[PDB]
């Protein structure tokens, strides 16, 4: 309401308040009487409909915060020149097609946010803003940065993610106080060797670019806590990169061009807790590669070219989560019994026809995903997986379940769809915690055991494309809730 706006403006000069909050008021045009309120040090105009700022704002010469996020601004008045104490300028979510020329003259600025505009260029005048400790210009259309970026020697955070950069000026190396360098989602073909000059660098966003290699000088950025190269064109790493990154907690090589593990042997993996190499073309895991990876607890090899596992994979005793999905494995060796700490084992989209007896020794296993294999049976020893909560067997060749399945009393999710099941064992009735049971697309499943009625927590059951011809047609046409009620009422457990 414009009535309220002018009312709040009078209140401000009446109280002589140093802060004016006009956010979220649907303001199209700011009244020129704001020129009166020269005591202001903070002015909040965010979340309005401003297309321009009146020149009278240049009269607010004591402002240290000018907050304009989420408007429709297409420029700024040259009168902002007078705001010689301005420290924070927030211009996110506007419609600027360039950094307004007056912003390049606001040399007192330390904090400048330009996210989500339409900017294509950063002028050499950016060197005027030499006191900037935070520059964010992500989500624009910038293709190049000027060499003058190197004159922002107080920069702590530089965020140029979500642009169209093909290169970084080598002068980035002169911004030696940078701890956050955000370059993800650009078109970067390389990094400058001067990136090693940023000895305080601790967060480096590189994912979704076009990198073919990482400079050896990155080894100097020994405060890096994560290295995430996801979605680039990288196939190797510089010789001593990873062992030099002594604080590395996580390494992501996903969606690159890897065919082999990076050379350097086991010491490269001594500090990381997680290794993600999904979506590459890696054809083997080297013998002994994790012999020094004492804290590595998560390994993701999904969607590679593995046809077998290394001979020592039973020694991966620190592993808690293991994803081998979408490879070409034909067997799992009996030595799997060594992974007694494993909690998540993802094996979907492989060529497995059977599972080893040693599977029964995975005493901590909580999730086992085997969808889209060729499994013709399950070993009797799966009955020993007492921690198991989720068992996914969708799209396999199963004809029966072992009766021992009923010993998995912590199971909540059982996926049996798209199999060859002719019946469910009566022992399913001791799955006291079962909540989701998927039976869809078992075309020779003509009946269900009355014991299914003892699964008191069952709330999702799918039975589409099961004939279930031994049940009344009206009941199976009514769907799972009718089937279960029928099993309760017509079976021996109705009183229960």
């Amino acid at each position: 309401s414009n009535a309220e706006v002018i009312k709040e403006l009078n209140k401000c000069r009446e109280e002589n308040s140093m802060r004016l909050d006009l956010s979220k008021r649907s303001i199209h045009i700011l009244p020129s009487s704001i020129k009166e309120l020269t005591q202001l040090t903070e002015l909040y105009l965010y979340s309005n409909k401003l297309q321009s700022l009146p020149a009278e704002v240049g009269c607010l010469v004591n402002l240290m915060t000018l907050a304009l996020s989420e408007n429709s601004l297409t420029s700024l008045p040259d009168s902002l020149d007078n705001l010689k104490k301005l420290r924070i300028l927030d211009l996110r979510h506007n419609k600027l097609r360039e950094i307004p020329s007056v912003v390049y003259r606001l040399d007192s600025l330390t904090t400048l946010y330009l996210r989500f505009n339409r900017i294509t260029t950063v002028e050499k005048d950016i060197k005027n803003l030499s006191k900037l400790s935070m520059l964010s210009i992500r989500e624009n259309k910038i293709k190049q940065l000027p060499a003058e970026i190197g004159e922002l020697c107080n920069l702590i955070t530089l965020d140029v993610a979500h642009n169209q950069l093909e290169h970084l000026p080598k002068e980035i190396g002169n911004c030696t106080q940078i701890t956050n360098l955000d370059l993800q989602h650009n078109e970067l073909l390389d990094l400058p060797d001067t990136i090693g000059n940023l000895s305080s660098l601790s967060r480096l966003g590189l994912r979704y670019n076009r990198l073919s290699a990482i400079p050896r000088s990155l080894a100097k950025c020994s405060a890096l806590e994560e290295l995430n190269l996801e979605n680039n064109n990288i196939s190797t790493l510089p010789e001593s990169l990873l062992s030099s990154l002594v604080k590395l907690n996580s390494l992501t090589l996903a969606r690159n061009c890897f065919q082999l593990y990076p050379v350097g042997g086991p010491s490269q993996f001594s500090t990381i807790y997680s290794l993600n190499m999904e979506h590459n073309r890696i054809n083997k895991i080297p013998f002994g590669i994790f012999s020094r990876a004492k804290v590595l607890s998560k390994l993701n090899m999904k969607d590679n070219q593995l046809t077998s596992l290394p001979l020592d994979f039973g020694t991966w005793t620190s592993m808690v989560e293991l994803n081998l999905a979408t490879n070409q494995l034909t067997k799992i060796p009996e030595d799997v019994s060594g992974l007694v700490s494993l909690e998540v084992l993802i094996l979907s989209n492989n060529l497995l026809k059977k599972l080893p007896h040693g599977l029964g020794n995975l005493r901590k296993l909580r999730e086992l995903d085997l969808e889209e294999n060729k499994l013709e049976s399950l070993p009797n020893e799966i009955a020993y997986l007492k921690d198991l909560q989720k068992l996914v067997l969708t799209n396999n060749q199963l004809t029966t379940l072992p009766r021992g399945i009923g010993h998995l009393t912590n199971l909540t999710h059982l996926g049996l769809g798209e199999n060859l099941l002719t019946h469910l064992p009566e022992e399913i009735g001791t799955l006291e915690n079962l909540e989701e049971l998927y039976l869809n697309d078992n075309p020779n499943l003509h009946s269900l055991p009355f014991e299914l009625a003892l699964c008191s927590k069952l709330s999702i059951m799918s039975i589409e494309n099961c004939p279930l011809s031994h049940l009344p047609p009206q009941i199976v046409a009514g769907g799972p809730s009718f089937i279960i009620q029928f099993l309760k009422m017509q079976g021996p457990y109705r009183a229960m």
Binding site: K49, E70, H93, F116, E187, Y208, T326, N349, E372, N395
Partner: protein
């Protein structure tokens, strides 16, 4: 990726009798998915586009009907395109349809745009055909590769500050455009909330405000909702799809909203024309009717 060769073979069957497949290799199609996926993520989830632009509604895998659309409108890059979703399911050649669209997206990424429809969703296109077609002609691994790609599609577009486009429609929760920008990708489509409603909701003339939707998902919204939305965000038009309309397109709320449907004689059950909307340099629209 041999992009021009893929496009050539996809266009080779132009003129032939409908139904004739195009046998791209598995590695070619997965390459289309991977390369378009990263381009989708390199661009905003709320696209800001400029006219001239041709806007098309549902295709639903009617590949030869899509080839006719490009004949009337001009094959890229002769014209710029925005499609509003629902490329797969129902039709007979979902694969050829999506592959050509992805190839054009990779080839002309600044001039060709694809929004997400409610069928660009694994839980939906598992049921209505695309999964079956994938498993028939290739394999499940490829279908899941498509899902990774669909999960990255943008959700809405605004053309020249004035035309707001999405597949489904408005949401009770949509109060500022930056809420759409805060939708993270890759993502599945949720059962309810903003992203659901943008892909699932429908206008309705008999509803005052918001009403429940016969589909069992999301909402209906009335003409007064449309008017207040346009006024709030200083827009002139909502362009959406998602509902088959007899004459290819249908105005709503005194032409403040248009429904576009580009799949003529949809499924075979409906005797409907398709249509596209051409937007010129001055935001003047024109509607081309596509005969069955």
């Amino acid at each position: 990726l041999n992009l021009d060769s893929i496009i050539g073979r996809l266009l080779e069957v132009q003129g032939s009798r409908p139904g004739k497949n195009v046998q791209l290799t598995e590695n070619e199609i997965r390459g289309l998915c991977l390369k378009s996926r990263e381009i989708f993520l390199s661009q905003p989830i709320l696209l800001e586009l400029e006219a001239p632009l041709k806007i098309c509604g549902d295709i639903h895998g009617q590949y030869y009907d899509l080839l006719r659309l490009f004949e009337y409108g001009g094959f890229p890059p002769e014209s710029n395109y925005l499609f509003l979703g629902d490329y797969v399911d129902r039709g007979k050649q979902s694969l050829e349809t999506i592959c050509l669209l992805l190839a054009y997206k990779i080839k002309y990424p600044e001039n060709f745009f694809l929004l997400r429809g409610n069928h660009e969703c694994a839980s939906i296109n598992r049921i209505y055909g695309f999964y079956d077609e994938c498993k028939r002609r290739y394999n499940i691994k490829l279908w899941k590769t498509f899902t990774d790609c669909f999960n990255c599609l943008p959700i809405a577009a605004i053309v020249d500050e004035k035309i707001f486009c999405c597949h489904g429609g408005l949401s009770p929760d949509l109060q500022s455009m930056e809420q759409i920008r805060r939708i993270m990708r890759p993502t599945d489509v949720p059962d309810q909330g903003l992203l659901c409603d943008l892909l699932w909701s429908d206008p309705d003339k008999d509803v005052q405000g918001w009403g429940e939707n016969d589909r069992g998902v999301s909402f209906t919204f009335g003409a007064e909702v449309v008017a207040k939305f346009l006024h709030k965000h200083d827009l002139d038009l909502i362009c959406r799809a998602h509902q088959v309309v007899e004459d290819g397109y249908e105005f709503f709320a005194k032409r403040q909203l248009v429904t576009l449907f580009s799949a003529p004689n949809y499924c075979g059950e409906f005797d409907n024309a398709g249509a596209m909307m051409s937007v010129d340099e001055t935001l003047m629209c024109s509607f081309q009717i596509l005969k069955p």
